[PDB]
């Protein structure tokens, strides 16, 4: 049995401001730093250690991973940082306040923009300051890879091949992997591993700062998955 | 003209205790964290940015690099962490107090153990708790690669091939490199780049927390090297 550990980052400064974030590279709040450190200490105490780590190119995830690795005394671990694990891109909604947006355009419209499976937020133009093409960390991306907007469906289209092309082959080689990433790139991955429908994934929100452990059989079929930590605290956070 | 930036980490807790450190994985003090952050801010203000970073597997160097990358807003940068950039291994002296050692064995003997070019500190045995073979981050090393002790000469024997086999080819490919490392692994590299003799390198101490910039010609021969920062502060630190 091979284990995989997933961790969603904690509170960012834009979560405190209630803003759509997407690929905007906002930092963790002090509270989200504390959540990362608590997750790493809990992993140590439950006896987990790793051989390799994946994360995104967004600092709220990278800093989560760095804090977890420090609590494990594994700052030396090999790390790969990939845009393919980035949060869903929120198009022209990036930076707007969610409550103000719901007031101006309607609650139902925001519910569709946030959670309709293949519904896309309104698009950026390439001349917008927020277009990823202007940012040096995406220098190697093609037009087609640079998003103007993403739904969960489009997020799935880029996270699952990376899982299949890169992360899963490394696990098959016997390496113990940790992934530190984001709400919708982890909803994408969990939808796939758990064979969930569109209707099922609609309801799922992964709790922040909570280790999610997958067990895989000899054929790398998932056998079970579970959270580490205080059950009442975690289940509340998942709501 | 291609540029390379070197940075030595700052004060560790064992530097404050005046202890031989070597491969012992001690953390930065608050003062050494501040030095890392100051070096990164200075690099930003002087207009430097990077495409790739190398460091050791020792957290005082890794944490220096992480703080520098945060000040540059390049936490997303690809990082390679290699034991081949580790500090010189201090053998059985690791953990001892330098002043107590000089008292018990003599000042001249400690001067030879610290700085005789090919003089080796007294050796560990493989059963010692400090033997690197017991530590998971060296799992892939051979007996021959696991040190019992190192002189500067032996440090050179492992740092320069890594430069020639790995770092320099990446620079030739047009990538802007930063290296965050240690006193004697950087003395090894500077001896080589500056074509210094044994007598010359004896005197050289690279100041901590100070960007050292190399310029390379079209044939990757070094053309010049210089420090960034306040000259009086740096020259004092170099003493
Ligand atoms: Cl890293």
Curated annotation (Swiss-Prot), chains A, B:
One of its GO terms (biological process) is canonical glycolysis. Pathway: Carbohydrate degradation; glycolysis; pyruvate from D-glyceraldehyde 3-phosphate: step 3/5. GO terms for cellular component: cytoplasm; cytosol. Induction: Regulated by the Fur protein. The record marks 182 as: Transition state stabilizer. Keywords: Acetylation, Gluconeogenesis, Glycolysis, Isomerase. Strongly inhibited by vanadate. Substrate binds at residues 8-15, 21-22, 60, 87-90, 98, 114-115, 183-184. GO terms for molecular function: ATP binding; guanosine tetraphosphate binding; phosphoglycerate mutase activity; protein homodimerization activity. Belongs to the phosphoglycerate mutase family. BPG-dependent PGAM subfamily. HAMAP family: PGAM_GpmA. Catalyzes the interconversion of 2-phosphoglycerate and 3-phosphoglycerate. NCBIfam families: pgm_1 (TIGR01258), PRK14115.1 (NF010713). Homodimer. Has a 10-fold higher specific activity than BPG-independent phosphoglycerate mutase. Inhibition by vanadate is a diagnostic test for discrimination between the cofactor-dependent (GpmA) and -independent (GpmI) phosphoglycerate mutases. This is 2,3-bisphosphoglycerate-dependent phosphoglycerate mutase. The gene is gpmA.
């Amino acid at each position: 049995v091979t284990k995989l550990v997933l961790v969603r980052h904690g509170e960012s400064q834009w979560n405190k401001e209630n803003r759509f974030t997407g690929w905007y590279d906002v930092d963790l709040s002090e509270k989200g730093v504390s959540e990362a450190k608590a997750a790493g200490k809990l992993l140590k105490e439950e006896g987990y250690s790793f051989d390799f780590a994946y994360t995104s190119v967004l600092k709220r995830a990278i800093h989560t991973l760095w804090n977890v690795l420090d609590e494990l005394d594994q700052a030396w671990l090999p790390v790969e940082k990939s845009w393919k694990l980035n949060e869903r891109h929120y198009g022209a909604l990036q930076g707007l306040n969610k409550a103000e947006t719901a007031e101006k355009y309607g609650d139902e419209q925001v519910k569709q923009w946030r959670r309709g499976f293949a519904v896309t937020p309104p698009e950026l133009t390439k001349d917008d300051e927020r277009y990823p093409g202007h940012d040096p960390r995406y220098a190697k991306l093609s037009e087609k890879e640079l998003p103007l907007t993403e739904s969960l469906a489009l997020t799935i289209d880029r996270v699952i091949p990376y899982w299949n092309e890169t992360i899963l082959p490394r696990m098959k080689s016997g390496e113990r992997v940790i992934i530190a990433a984001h709400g919708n790139s982890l909803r994408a991955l969990v939808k796939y591993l758990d064979n969930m429908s569109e209707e099922e994934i609609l309801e799922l929100n992964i709790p922040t700062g909570v280790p999610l452990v997958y067990e895989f059989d000899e054929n790398f079929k998932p056998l079970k998955r579970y959270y580490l930590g205080n059950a009442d605290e975690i289940a509340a956070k998942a709501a």
